[PDB]
Write a protein that binds this ligand. Structure first.
Ligand SMILES: [Cl-]
Ligand SMILES: [Cl-]
Ligand code: NA
Ligand code: NI
Ligand SMILES: [Zn+2]
Lengths: 242, 159
């Protein structure tokens, strides 16, 4: 039973020569099912270390990193925990690198009339957000927008990662690093108003907010990025988190 | 003496990194036990593949009495544990389908699959039913406190 008939013979032949059997077993290196569809909202904890995530007009699906052409072409800077912490501390020196992060805070603080310094200090209390921003940044040529929303359950903030365009591809290494670096956070991929988004919420090295606040004040952001954040916050105010 | 040969063969199929062999007694191909036939386990941080299909088929081939071989995977809290049965235990049928190859296990958590369900899934898919043209492997990433499992059908390279 259970297709025992067709395998009986081959197993019988292989019993005589074990080495051949070992070679045959080792031969099966290529996976027949490259991709597997998923449904939004999709939680990243349900991925495996070598899984990539694609959200496009052709649908939502997980991929096997080794076989993924986008993953091999991409092959994506350093993402060490120490490196992430180093970025977080040297944030004031590389304030230009994190415009997408900080300008968001500016716009948010303006939108709801409130002191920017307090918001900044509060969010600097949650370094994992800056971690996600750093990881997803890569080198800098690709920059996802960032929104921050008050978390009713735990207080503090949760992160909206805003992907550009109608297509999004999350490298396996990036998902693995995101999950491992932020163990106190859960990540859920979703879509809202024609925009693919990655929500980071709380599941269960100190910096001075003042110096950063003064510098931001001293620096004029791009303009339009600011407007972009106005539009984005306008769009996502009604978006219900999963 | 036969069971030793079987578990030796299976041991040869399973990678050396996964520690094990004969599991936790003696039996003939005529009489099959409820207790596990073989045991393998992998420590924290390991990335190891388990040739589940091949092993289950070997066990089903070895038996002279009808049975539905079952592989049980557990996250014990300190390792990943693969245990081989000729009959699935009472009170774990399978949370794997052609639509979901991934299963993530928390501490003290169990999943598993039988050869019948495996064959059913392989049939649902349009994959080659011919011997050795398609063999399912379990991609295991041990990351305590969790264990990541990916039940993926692998094919030959013939190169
Ligand atoms: Cl030990
Ligand atoms: Cl691992
Ligand atoms: Na991953
Ligand atoms: Ni051990
Ligand atoms: Zn990919």
């Amino acid at each position: 039973l259970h297709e025992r008939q067709r395998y009986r013979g081959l197993f019988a032949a292989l019993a005589q020569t074990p080495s051949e059997e070992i070679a045959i077993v080792r031969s099966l290196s290529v996976p027949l099912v490259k991709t597997t569809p998923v449904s939004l909202p999709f939680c990243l904890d349900q991925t495996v270390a070598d899984n990539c995530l694609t959200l496009s007009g052709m649908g939502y699906y997980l991929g096997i990193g080794g076989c993924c052409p986008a993953c091999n072409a991409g092959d994506g800077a350093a993402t060490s925990r120490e490196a992430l912490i180093l970025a977080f501390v040297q944030q004031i020196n590389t304030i230009f690198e994190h415009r997408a992060f900080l300008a968001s805070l500016v716009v948010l603080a303006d939108r709801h009339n409130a002191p920017l310094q307090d918001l900044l200090a509060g969010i600097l209390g949650q370094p994992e957000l800056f971690f996600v921003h750093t990881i997803l940044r890569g080198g800098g040529a690709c920059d996802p927008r960032l929104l921050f929303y008050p978390d009713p359950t735990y207080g503090g903030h949760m992160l909206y990662v805003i992907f550009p365009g109608t297509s999004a591809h999350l490298h396996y290494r990036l998902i693995d690093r995101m999950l491992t670096a932020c163990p106190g956070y859960r990540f859920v991929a979703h879509v809202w108003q024609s925009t693919f988004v990655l929500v980071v919420r709380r599941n269960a090295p100190t910096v001075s907010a003042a110096d950063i606040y003064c510098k931001m004040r001293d620096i004029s952001f791009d303009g339009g990025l600011m407007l972009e954040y106005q539009r984005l916050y306008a769009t996502f105010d009604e978006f219900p988190p999963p | 003496p036969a069971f030793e040969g079987l578990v030796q063969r299976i041991r040869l199929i399973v990678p050396s990194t996964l520690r094990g062999g004969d599991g936790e007694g003696p039996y003939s191909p005529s009489s099959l036990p409820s207790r596990c036939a073989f045991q393998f386990h992998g420590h924290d941080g390991s990335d190891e593949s388990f040739p589940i299909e091949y092993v289950l088929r070997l066990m089903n081939d070895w038996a002279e009495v009808p049975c539905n071989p079952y592989l049980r995977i557990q996250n014990t809290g300190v390792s990943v544990l693969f245990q081989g049965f000729f009959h699935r235990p009472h009170n774990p049928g399978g949370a794997i389908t052609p639509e979901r190859t991934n299963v993530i296990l928390g501490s003290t958590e169990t999943t598993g699959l039988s050869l019948g369900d495996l064959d059913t899934i392989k049939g649902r898919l349009g994959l080659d039913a011919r011997p050795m043209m398609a063999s399912m492997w379990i991609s295991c990433f041990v990351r305590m406190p969790r264990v990541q499992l990916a039940f993926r059908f692998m094919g030959p390279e013939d190169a």
